[PDB]
Scaffold this active site. Sequence first.
Site, PDB file in Angstrom:
ATOM      1  N   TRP D 161       0.801  -1.217   0.000  1.00  0.00           N
ATOM      2  CA  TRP D 161       0.000   0.000   0.000  1.00  0.00           C
ATOM      3  C   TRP D 161       0.837   1.271   0.000  1.00  0.00           C
ATOM      4  O   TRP D 161       0.300   2.342  -0.297  1.00  0.00           O
ATOM      5  CB  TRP D 161      -0.937   0.022   1.215  1.00  0.00           C
ATOM      6  CG  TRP D 161      -0.269  -0.344   2.507  1.00  0.00           C
ATOM      7  CD1 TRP D 161      -0.330  -1.545   3.144  1.00  0.00           C
ATOM      8  CD2 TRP D 161       0.562   0.498   3.314  1.00  0.00           C
ATOM      9  NE1 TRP D 161       0.412  -1.507   4.298  1.00  0.00           N
ATOM     10  CE2 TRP D 161       0.969  -0.263   4.425  1.00  0.00           C
ATOM     11  CE3 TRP D 161       0.999   1.820   3.205  1.00  0.00           C
ATOM     12  CZ2 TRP D 161       1.792   0.253   5.419  1.00  0.00           C
ATOM     13  CZ3 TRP D 161       1.818   2.329   4.191  1.00  0.00           C
ATOM     14  CH2 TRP D 161       2.205   1.548   5.284  1.00  0.00           C
ATOM     15  N   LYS D 185      -2.834  -8.758  -7.123  1.00  0.00           N
ATOM     16  CA  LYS D 185      -3.713  -8.590  -5.968  1.00  0.00           C
ATOM     17  C   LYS D 185      -3.239  -7.330  -5.252  1.00  0.00           C
ATOM     18  O   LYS D 185      -2.196  -7.355  -4.575  1.00  0.00           O
ATOM     19  CB  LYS D 185      -3.674  -9.827  -5.072  1.00  0.00           C
ATOM     20  CG  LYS D 185      -3.737  -9.610  -3.558  1.00  0.00           C
ATOM     21  CD  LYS D 185      -5.032  -8.956  -3.110  1.00  0.00           C
ATOM     22  CE  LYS D 185      -5.062  -8.781  -1.603  1.00  0.00           C
ATOM     23  NZ  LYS D 185      -3.895  -8.011  -1.094  1.00  0.00           N
ATOM     24  N   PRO D 186      -3.928  -6.204  -5.414  1.00  0.00           N
ATOM     25  CA  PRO D 186      -3.495  -4.970  -4.756  1.00  0.00           C
ATOM     26  C   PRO D 186      -3.956  -4.891  -3.308  1.00  0.00           C
ATOM     27  O   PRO D 186      -4.919  -5.535  -2.891  1.00  0.00           O
ATOM     28  CB  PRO D 186      -4.160  -3.876  -5.601  1.00  0.00           C
ATOM     29  CG  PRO D 186      -5.392  -4.500  -6.104  1.00  0.00           C
ATOM     30  CD  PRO D 186      -5.105  -5.971  -6.271  1.00  0.00           C
ATOM     31  N   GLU D 188      -5.634  -3.723   0.121  1.00  0.00           N
ATOM     32  CA  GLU D 188      -6.979  -3.229   0.379  1.00  0.00           C
ATOM     33  C   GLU D 188      -6.992  -1.747   0.723  1.00  0.00           C
ATOM     34  O   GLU D 188      -8.015  -1.086   0.517  1.00  0.00           O
ATOM     35  CB  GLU D 188      -7.635  -4.029   1.509  1.00  0.00           C
ATOM     36  CG  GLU D 188      -6.872  -4.034   2.828  1.00  0.00           C
ATOM     37  CD  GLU D 188      -5.880  -5.176   2.930  1.00  0.00           C
ATOM     38  OE1 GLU D 188      -5.345  -5.594   1.881  1.00  0.00           O
ATOM     39  OE2 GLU D 188      -5.634  -5.653   4.057  1.00  0.00           O
ATOM     40  N   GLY D 218      -5.274  -9.883   2.079  1.00  0.00           N
ATOM     41  CA  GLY D 218      -4.149 -10.785   2.033  1.00  0.00           C
ATOM     42  C   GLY D 218      -4.490 -12.201   2.455  1.00  0.00           C
ATOM     43  O   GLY D 218      -4.147 -13.170   1.772  1.00  0.00           O
ATOM     44  N   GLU D 261       9.949  -9.220  -1.523  1.00  0.00           N
ATOM     45  CA  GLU D 261      10.568  -7.934  -1.210  1.00  0.00           C
ATOM     46  C   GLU D 261      10.013  -7.487   0.135  1.00  0.00           C
ATOM     47  O   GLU D 261       8.853  -7.070   0.224  1.00  0.00           O
ATOM     48  CB  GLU D 261      10.286  -6.903  -2.301  1.00  0.00           C
ATOM     49  CG  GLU D 261      11.039  -5.592  -2.134  1.00  0.00           C
ATOM     50  CD  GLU D 261      10.492  -4.494  -3.027  1.00  0.00           C
ATOM     51  OE1 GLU D 261      10.605  -3.308  -2.655  1.00  0.00           O
ATOM     52  OE2 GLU D 261       9.947  -4.820  -4.102  1.00  0.00           O
ATOM     53  N   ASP D 344      -1.729   3.558  14.726  1.00  0.00           N
ATOM     54  CA  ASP D 344      -1.600   3.050  16.086  1.00  0.00           C
ATOM     55  C   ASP D 344      -0.257   2.369  16.296  1.00  0.00           C
ATOM     56  O   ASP D 344       0.352   2.504  17.362  1.00  0.00           O
ATOM     57  CB  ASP D 344      -2.742   2.084  16.395  1.00  0.00           C
ATOM     58  CG  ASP D 344      -4.105   2.727  16.256  1.00  0.00           C
ATOM     59  OD1 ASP D 344      -4.172   3.969  16.159  1.00  0.00           O
ATOM     60  OD2 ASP D 344      -5.113   1.990  16.243  1.00  0.00           O
ATOM     61  N   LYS D 345       0.215   1.614  15.302  1.00  0.00           N
ATOM     62  CA  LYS D 345       1.497   0.934  15.461  1.00  0.00           C
ATOM     63  C   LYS D 345       2.634   1.935  15.640  1.00  0.00           C
ATOM     64  O   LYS D 345       3.510   1.747  16.494  1.00  0.00           O
ATOM     65  CB  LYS D 345       1.756   0.024  14.261  1.00  0.00           C
ATOM     66  CG  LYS D 345       2.865  -0.988  14.486  1.00  0.00           C
ATOM     67  CD  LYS D 345       3.205  -1.740  13.212  1.00  0.00           C
ATOM     68  CE  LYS D 345       2.055  -2.628  12.768  1.00  0.00           C
ATOM     69  NZ  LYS D 345       2.476  -3.599  11.725  1.00  0.00           N
TER      70      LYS D 345
END
Lengths: 493, 485, 485, 493
Positions: D161, D185-186, D188, D218, D261, D344-345
């Site tokens: 993202w 698959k991008p 979300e 994912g 990666e 938050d992280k």
Amino acid sequence: LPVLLTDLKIQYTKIFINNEWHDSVSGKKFPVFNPATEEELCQVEEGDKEDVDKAVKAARQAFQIGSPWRTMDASERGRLLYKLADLIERDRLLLATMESMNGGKLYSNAYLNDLAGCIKTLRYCAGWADKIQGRTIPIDGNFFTYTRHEPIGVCGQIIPWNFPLVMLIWKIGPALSCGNTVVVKPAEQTPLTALHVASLIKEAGFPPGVVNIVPGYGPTAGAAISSHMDIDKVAFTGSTEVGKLIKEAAGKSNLKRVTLELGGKSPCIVLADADLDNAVEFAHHGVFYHQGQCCIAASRIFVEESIYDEFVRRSVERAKKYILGNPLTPGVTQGPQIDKEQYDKILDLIESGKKEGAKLECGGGPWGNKGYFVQPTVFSNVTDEMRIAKEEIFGPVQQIMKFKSLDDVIKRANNTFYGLSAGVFTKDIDKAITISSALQAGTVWVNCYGVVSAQCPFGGFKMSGNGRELGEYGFHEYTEVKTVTVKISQKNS
Amino acid sequence: KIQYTKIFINNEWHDSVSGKKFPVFNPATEEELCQVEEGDKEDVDKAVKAARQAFQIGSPWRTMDASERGRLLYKLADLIERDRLLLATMESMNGGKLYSNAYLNDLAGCIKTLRYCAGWADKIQGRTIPIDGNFFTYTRHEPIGVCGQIIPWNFPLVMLIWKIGPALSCGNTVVVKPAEQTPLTALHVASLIKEAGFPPGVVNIVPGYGPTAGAAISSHMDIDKVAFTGSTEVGKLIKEAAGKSNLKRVTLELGGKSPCIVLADADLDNAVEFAHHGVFYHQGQCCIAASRIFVEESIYDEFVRRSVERAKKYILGNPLTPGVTQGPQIDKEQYDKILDLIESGKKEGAKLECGGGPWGNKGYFVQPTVFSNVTDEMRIAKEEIFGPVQQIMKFKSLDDVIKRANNTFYGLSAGVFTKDIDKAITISSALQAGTVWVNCYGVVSAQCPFGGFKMSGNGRELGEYGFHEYTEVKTVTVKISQKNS
Amino acid sequence: KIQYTKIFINNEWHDSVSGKKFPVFNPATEEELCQVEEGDKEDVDKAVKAARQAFQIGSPWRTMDASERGRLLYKLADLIERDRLLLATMESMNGGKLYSNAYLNDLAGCIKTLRYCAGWADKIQGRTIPIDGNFFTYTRHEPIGVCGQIIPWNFPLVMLIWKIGPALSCGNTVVVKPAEQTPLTALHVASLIKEAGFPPGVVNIVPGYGPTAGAAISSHMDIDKVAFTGSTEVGKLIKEAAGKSNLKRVTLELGGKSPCIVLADADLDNAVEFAHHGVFYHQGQCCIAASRIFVEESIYDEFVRRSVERAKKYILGNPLTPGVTQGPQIDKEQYDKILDLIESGKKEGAKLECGGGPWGNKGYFVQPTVFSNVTDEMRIAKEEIFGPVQQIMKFKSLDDVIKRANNTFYGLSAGVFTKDIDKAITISSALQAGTVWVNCYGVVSAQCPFGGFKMSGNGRELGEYGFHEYTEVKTVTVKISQKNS
Amino acid sequence: LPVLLTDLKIQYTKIFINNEWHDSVSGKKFPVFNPATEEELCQVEEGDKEDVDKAVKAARQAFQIGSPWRTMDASERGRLLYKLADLIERDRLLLATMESMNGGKLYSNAYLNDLAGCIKTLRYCAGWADKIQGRTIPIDGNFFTYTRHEPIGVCGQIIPWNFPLVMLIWKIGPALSCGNTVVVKPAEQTPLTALHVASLIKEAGFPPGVVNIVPGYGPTAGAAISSHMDIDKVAFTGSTEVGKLIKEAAGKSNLKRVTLELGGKSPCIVLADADLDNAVEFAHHGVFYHQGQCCIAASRIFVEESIYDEFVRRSVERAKKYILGNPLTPGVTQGPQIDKEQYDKILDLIESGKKEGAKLECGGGPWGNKGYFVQPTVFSNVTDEMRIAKEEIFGPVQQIMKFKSLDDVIKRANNTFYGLSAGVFTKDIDKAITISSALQAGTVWVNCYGVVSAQCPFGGFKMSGNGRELGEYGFHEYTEVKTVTVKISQKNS
């Protein structure tokens, strides 16, 4: 002409760590047998996770910045590999006799083929030593960017039993050429030639810890190598199940690089406009070389209808002349398999083929009271559904299917999860290129088979392996690229 | 119309120093289109001065990004595609090339070569060497400098692109000297170069005459490289001049007498069609002309019978006309030489099959002439004709015919026709030719390199081989404190 | 002793067609060692006939395996290492090279180059091209043919190896013409070539005189390539002869006046030592001699003071003596020319610092002469000396000194000394030299390519760059039924 | 100068399969928010294993021998990629505004850095299209061996993202250049620009099924892609834990090729003899570019003893000026992060750094009532033991450690399990090369940082990824080598 020799004295049976011979810390020793006579040859030290760790520590120390192996000139690594090849050629007699005695391999091929490919591959990699190069990149902006193809680091390597010396060399050629330090784990069936070559590695003059060898079992030492955190790459050659296990163990731990060389149910399409004599002889050689214990064995001989019958009539006759006895004998053309397990597996698969309904055109069963011998077997009218036509037999069992149209055979040959190799037998210019393009195999042979040299890459497509070996391709998988970019005052084209 | 007939230097149009102007004639009617300035030693000198100013360290071009150079080349290709019709018609008129050949094969090939060389701009790379000792050594590919390019008349636009696209992709400044016969296309392409956005002085054009302009380029001290694509005598004269002045790099692409070896197993229809095309493509004025079309005995009489038939359906007419498959030649000298060669072949006993003489007093058109029973001592099989003349020779053994095909001082290209893998591979390796075709002929593309094995050529083109010719390798070694693998 | 003084052809020793023999003199005492057969046009012709027989299709060499060619080269290198002492002493005597220089640098370098070219034998590869259309196109590297190699006297063995190792690794047949001064080492190496097991006719040696033998090689029709490594006048005479006969390929490695740019940030001790070595290595007869040793003002007077001191410790004596760091020159002509250049430098006002004249009537020895305050119009800074003469020039600005170093027709090599990353990269990319050293000089190895950017050379060596010079490229395009990615 | 933006209309929110827009077979739709305002932009179709399967089927059909994409000329694939790049340059305005609105990225960098990098990478790969070439090998014996660098097959690709468009292009550049068909698959968080580029892919003229896109999560769609049996390669970019999971899922089933990666904790050594202004500016840019949400973020700024205090003094000043507002507003230099989870992280890791004992010299808390904004934070006197000095923060938090000797700093920088990047700031010629050699990183920058172009390869050494991208190296990863060997009459050198 091979000198017969007919004698050995196995004085090397320990674990090779730090250019020294150490017993396993456990102290256990496992026996290594002779397939022809089932008699124990010696007791090889049994390594495990503890010994694998004791070896990986030495390898890592050897790989430290400032150690001899790191400050060694690339040309010097090439010269050391060349001296190792010279030492092996000096001991070609002993190594060939050991390979035939312990691997059940025919002494004529053990001397003329396998030892020859060993010296050739070692010399090819020694040549490559100081010719793997990076690139200076034309990056945008006033920057000077280049790449270093550095050694990956510690590379655990798991050898099979079918080609002990050839695979040992295929592993420690590119690895040592590119500057890495290796912890090899040889098969328990064939651990002796690796240890003698380890002594030869010490003699040639490699720095301590650059190459270490741990004889043991796959579950104990191979799994330890594949799950070690301090190991940067794992290069495994063997069955597909253990390949998946190696991939898993690598993914779980320290995300190391993985290079798998797995089996294959390779096809051999024989079209109508084929040289029937050459096609028959090469089909026989492809499916029967090394008692069928070759990863590239032609286990699916497709034949077009117009020439099917003849082919079978000529295949059986070729399989009926196949002498089968003691490897150390000039007239012998087939030997024991490797050990009891594979012998039983081959017998069981022969029985399965018989039950399924494949015409047994040649005798399927043991030969001789002593030794793990199987009669050259031929199956005709085989269909793609039968087990024998889908599962890697790894024995002297020849399948012969019939097809009508070319696209049908392309689909039938590509209709599998194995992609190691394929063969096409035709005289045309269009058929050859078309089929070579369309066949999903990592090595397509046209009008030949089993043609491998140090130069060309070898590998599989779908589940028959990851990556390639044997050449510039094989070497770039033993190096890590490091892009160094420097901000400069001004750049000019 | 032709609004560009001057000397293109520093992105601007100049008249010649002497003021002299030479004519350009359309061979289809020999009605001169416009007068083009005659480039002389002074014009070449000023164009080279402009180029050497454009190549100077710190100039926009030298400090340009290789990716940006490729982007400029792609812009140039897209602009050339925008005006495809104008360039196609102008090429067909000036050189007599058939309009279908000028549009669907010439301009498309030019576009493809430009867009290939544009792609190679920022992917060509030097290498980091693992030298001995505590040193860090690397090499880099630098543009050589000024590239004096001599582009004869058979393929004006395609050759100009084959010359500049590699040069403008490797980062060199081109001083292109076109053919006196066909100088207009280069000038219009220079106008499109200005439109694309090339820095001034990167590309300069000096139309004129080879003896004066081309010789001036080849003798100039500041011309780093000379790239000639034409006759072997002129190539010999350029090489000797190149050595005498500056020891300049020399790249000579000369025409050749190239064999097409047809065997019994070969598909007769395809073999006949491709032998026809490989010699009569672009009315024979092709450096790759299949001039020694050998044939196997078993189908020999069957080949000519069909081959001649095809020559009888080859429509001859004005290039712009639809349904025409051939045009006039390039000028009167080539017309006279073609007729001289035909008469010499008749005199020496070459059995004529079809055509065999001029036609259409209106223009320089020539009938497609098919000879037969030609041999290896005749002067129509060993002398390069550059005309629609076929020489259907014969052979019986493979080694002897191989020695025949290699019995020559010319090795630019060769052909093989055979339905047998073994024969195909054996013949292609055996023949001493830069490009050996199999079951086809004249399949030239920007990817596949082009050069000549013998006196017919020197150097390679069209690929990663054609981009190390326009560059020098500069090695830099730095003493470091301690080297590690 | 010298048991080999004849013409080496077809692995056998022959006397000259005329029977004439020229002398070889040891410059240390000028007592002739032995008489060596004089190669003339007929000897060159017969050697070329032998080579062209060895290169024929189907011959042992053409059908040999590239890996086997490399194995043969490794055998040759190991045999040369076996007799390292004999070759080292013979080189030191014949050429006057110091024994330490002849043994620890010359023979070791020869062995390394042979074992590098041996490694490259089976790893040079052609390429498969993604051509357009339903065609399968690939290219291959074929040996070019006969390689006439002219090896002047400054580095007889090292240059002979630099010439053959690449040729015998790419699969070419060499006709090596050595220097009249030092022809013996090539002959002994040919005897070792016979011992190694090369097919007869692969390597031939034709000792003689350049005007007769070398010119014969360069004008021969069947010599595919000519590779000369020597004076620029001879290089130009070879290039013009090469073009005139056969349009043969030409590879000229000429000497040059190469700058060593010392800056204030540079480590003064290392800078002084390396500037000393780069000009007085092998008694100045080095194509890479650092003849324009520039210095920054801030340390200028401090540099010369130390530099001269080193020149005063340079021991001059017989090459075989221990503790000697310099030997005699190659012959009397070079002696006279060196003295002429010294006198001209004195006349033009070059401030002498140390030495500055001949010494030791016994031989051709010359004192190490260090000039100072040299300028860019003097004939001791622009004329190539090939002698132990240093020219400690001066500069103040970086752009102007760059233009100085590039103000020349000679660009073989250059030097930079600086403790600054930015300065090092800027100067290395700025100089128009084909080998720019940083903080070091004369660091030549088989891996790093070698060539010249101007009239001081043409082509590259010593690496993949020096192995595409000895090969052609053959495209082969096959019409296939249907192509898929 | 970014062209001023206009209000958006997100008309592409479906699953892109077979050049067509389909709803998820489940029918579910998940919302995509705007990080600056937390307002839903639209409802993107939620793909899962079923949609991934029906996309892989189309990709496989597109990859069948004889389909347009297979019979397409390499130059034609390059031409199609170039036309896609032209379309993206045409829609550069809309794409940059979409990236800034949905990815929370600054519109200035979204238009100048990110969109520019996309067109440059697409054009680089389009150029490479018909220049990736095999080799004709000098094999021993009378054989003609060559290699074909064929497309691998179906390549599932998992985009992160942080750089939606740039990573989408990095994935579908080499893949489509080498002839493969992809199922992307991008993320979300950022599924919208990928869908618009999907419509552009259709417009450019790519054959149906060559590129398919499945927006989802994912665990559901990414895991389906990584575990699919009909997929030949998986190329994942993201966190290390999901990298291990991807490697596992590939190893368990299909033995597919894996290219990971992953993240990194990259050091930035600043020696005494460094251009302190440039060093400070580039340290700030390296650790704060894209709100620190860069895989190569300089999360460990080593500074030598002599220049430490000054470096902290001016780093605090540089970080105190970092204007922080709404991305679309001109003059803003920091925007929202991506979503609440990372917000938050980052806050939690800031608090952990405060508790451990790293001196908080700037920032260190939330910002704004609306949007996920964090103040530029600076920690000083950090030690290698603290959590902030070992864990990839992925937020605008700068760590500054002190060192004395160069050996110490080399070991400390090489004392992590991440190997993505490193930076060296010095004026010397010896220090630069020494440290670049010694630092175990896949991209070492000297006197700069964050310098990536399409040309030079990018990747990580130990656990920051497998393989490389961005150049001929990226291409080698996306092709399978097939050696074709033909028995010939005779071979000549």
